[PDB]
Structures are given as C-alpha cells and as structure tokens.
C-alpha cells in the first residue's frame, strides 16, 4: 500500500525500472470540487461497448476521449476530439509545467458509483510507445487503483486515489505491471479520472 507523496520504484526488471509518483492535493480542494462538477456536466460522457469473445457488452463506466489521434481498445475506437475543454487544457498544461512531461491525449473515465470499474489491463498499446509516461488526476470519491505484477513464462500494490491527487506512471510500469480500479461493496459517490497520454501515428 502506497499513500504518501513521494517517488516509488516498485520493480526493476524484466523491461527496466517501473516508477510511480504520487502527489496528493496537487489540485486544491475547492477547485477540485468545482472541476468535478463542471467535468461531470460538460464532458460528452458515453457508455461504450467492448467485445471480448464474439459478444458485445456495455462498459461499467462512462468515457470520453480528447486528442487529434484515436484510442482503440476492446474493439472500441474513440473518435478523436480536437476541441479540448478549456479546463482540461489548463490541467494538461499545469501537469506539463510542473512535471516536465508532455501530453497530446486525454482519456476521461466516470465511475458513477461503486458498481462501476475497469478490469485488469496494462497501458501497453503500440500507439502509446514502449516506456509510456501516463498522468492520472482524480476527482470525487476516493477509489482504489490496484496493481499486480505479471509473472514470467504474486506482487501487488494498492494506491488509494483521493480528490485532486496526481499520479504519474513511468518506466517499465506498463510492460511489467497491470492495473485496475475494482468494484466496491459499500456506497461510492462518482469519481472522475483524467489520464493524460502521448499517442503516436
């Protein structure tokens, strides 16, 4: 369990060092409140369908995408939105100015309540590069970001994500770890997560 501001090296092989950085309170409390409400009303949220075998299902979360290039996952292709919401552009720019990393893509997730989730995966697309740096900004109810390390052909890390917290994943994290946000068994209010990425042609 990791819940304090700091830089944490969670593994060093096989691809290399996997590093995650946690910055609670990166966005101040009242601004995070206001961001949560405005993004809940203004983001063009949709519940999209994935395909896993030969069947199509509804994802247990609302989603939206921003950026010039697209995000195709679970045979879902999120048409690219060029027109970034101004608040999202500002938050992108702040993350860039303080961290030193650049982004051109933003995925937005709305977990409506405790029944919403995202299943185990790694962010290992070919369009996102090999050692991808991904930034996560959270708003609303605290939810748990769970991680499990893959075995070679079981290490676990839990990161509670509270209102206004910035998380950075970099290094070998997508090659060597998977992550999810699990369903919960007690009531949860909505959570908005912003994950900023770099998408390549």
């Amino acid at each position: 369990v990791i819940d304090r501001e700091g830089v944490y090296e969670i593994s060093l092989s096989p691809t290399g060092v996997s590093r995650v950085c946690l910055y609670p309170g990166f966005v101040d409390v009242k601004e995070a409140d206001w961001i949560l409400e405005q993004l809940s009303q203004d983001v063009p949220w949709k519940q999209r369908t994935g395909i896993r075998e030969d069947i199509t299902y509804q994802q247990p979360r609302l989603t939206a995408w921003y950026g010039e290039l697209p995000y195709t996952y679970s045979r879902i292709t999120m048409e690219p939105n060029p027109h970034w919401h101004p608040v999202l552009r500002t938050l992108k720019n702040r993350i860039e100015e303080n961290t030193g990393h650049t982004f051109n893509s933003l995925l937005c997730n709305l977990y409506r309540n405790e029944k919403d989730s995202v299943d185990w995966h790694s962010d290992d697309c070919p369009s996102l590069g090999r050692s991808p740096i991904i930034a996560s900004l959270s708003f609303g109810a605290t939810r748990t970001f769970e991680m499990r390390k893959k075995p070679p052909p079981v290490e676990r890390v839990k990161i509670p994500l509270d209102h206004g917290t910035l998380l950075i994943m970099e290094g070998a994290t997508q090659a060597d770890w998977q992550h999810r946000v699990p369903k919960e068994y007690h009531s949860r209010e909505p959570r908005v997560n912003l994950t900023f990425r770099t998408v390549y042609p």
Partner: antibody
Amino acid sequence: VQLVESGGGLVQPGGSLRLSCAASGFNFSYSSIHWVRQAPGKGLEWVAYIYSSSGYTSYADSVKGRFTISADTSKNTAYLQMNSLRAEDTAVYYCARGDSWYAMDYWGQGTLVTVSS
Amino acid sequence: IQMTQSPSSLSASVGDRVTITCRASQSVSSAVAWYQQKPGKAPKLLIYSASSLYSGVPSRFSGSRSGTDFTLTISSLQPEDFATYYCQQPSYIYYPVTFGQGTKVEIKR
C-alpha cells in the same frame, strides 16, 4: 449576510485607488470573489476574480496589468488595487461572491469610482 | 470610448411569455448564469448551471440549453419581472468571465 464595498471615490487619470470589500454575516472561505463594474447607463462588465481557497486570479483584458485582486482570510476582506486608471474605468464597482466559481449569489451595493481631471 | 453596450429593450405586458436568448458560439460548457437588475440595486442571481433556479426565484422562471444557445424564459410576466436581465457567458474554471449585453423588459402601454 452582506458585502460592503469601500475605498472608492475620485482620482485623476493615471492615479491609484484601492477598493476594499468586507464580508459580514458570513465568511469568504472557499468562495470565488469577483469584481464586476457598471458604467452609468451601461451593462455589467466583469473585471476580475480570485479563487479565495487557492489564491488563483483572473482579469479582464481591459484591465490586465493594471488591476490586482487579493484577499485576506485573516481579515475576511477582498481588495482591488487599480493603478494607471483612465477615464473609461469610471463606474460603480460591485463586489460579489461565489459559492460556484462563476455564479455570483451575493453582491454588495457598489462603490462609485470617478476618474477625471 | 465605452467598454459596454447600452441595454437593449423589450416591450411586454403582464401575462406575456418572454424568452431571452444568449448565443455562446463554439462554447463547450453549460456553466451559465442569469441575473436580474432593477435601477439602483445590485444584480440578483436568477439561474445557475443553465437551468437551475436559485433559491427564492419563482417557478415561472426557467433556464434552458439548446446546442450552444442558452435561454431564460418567464412563463407569464408579473409586474416585478420588469427589469434588466443579464446572461453570463459559459464560465470555464480558471478562465475570465463575460457578461452579455443586458435585456431591459419595459412594460407596454
């Protein structure tokens, strides 16, 4: 619950004037505080705001680089420092506060500010 | 040189239905507020969040959103509804705030 504007009045072109806006009946805590203005017979012109919890500020184009909005949680008061005032800055200046970041639910009565020789 | 417009005018009698429109081209938010001002008084918040009535606002007031156009509607004008009305442009967090030109509902005779 009220907002009182003070510190207005008369100054010459180029002069300085520092408006104050005191909160009484409630406390400016996580509120957004705005200065809007209205010239005689004209419409509202938002000039500035501060997010009091974080201190973040925004200013109107007509006014940037000359005005500075600030607040004191210590004294429950906001301020508008107006430098290099010109004749068209003449107006009733309203202070207004916000639960939201934009929806101004409480307003003061306004101070008159006249800029002339 | 003037920074604002003089409020435009709308002539109406008691009982009429009035819909003021506020164009916000290429806006991408519904963070829109509507205000009322009578001569010599400060404005009053009528509507926040495009359609939500502020407390103490009668139910004959409603706010609506169609596309990028926002609307304030008074279903049947009462005598105390004759005043100037203002639309606050979509207000994005961290960005400036912009009031539209005021609409002044004067009474027909």
